[PDB]
């Protein structure tokens, strides 16, 4: 079992990429306001200061890549 769901890893693997959330939110088939929220909810689980560091959280984790 992970510490995401599916849609949070596949939300930031997409970050990662350099997607907005306009973009993300256009991909996966949600609203922008939804994708924030993800996002906002991860952070505040992984206890860290913003989207660089939930971002590098996930690699540190395994949970992402950098491709």
Do not use: M, P, W
């Not at 769901?5 to 991909?27: A, C, M, P, W």
């Amino acid at each position: 079992r992970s510490l995401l769901t599916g849609r949070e890893r596949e939300i930031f693997q997409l970050l990662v990429r350099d997607y907005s959330t306009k973009d993300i939110s256009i991909q996966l088939k949600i609203s922008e306001k939804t994708v924030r929220n993800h996002i906002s909810n991860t952070i505040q689980k992984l206890g860290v200061s913003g989207r660089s560091q939930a971002i590098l959280e996930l690699l540190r984790l395994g949970e992402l890549s950098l491709d």
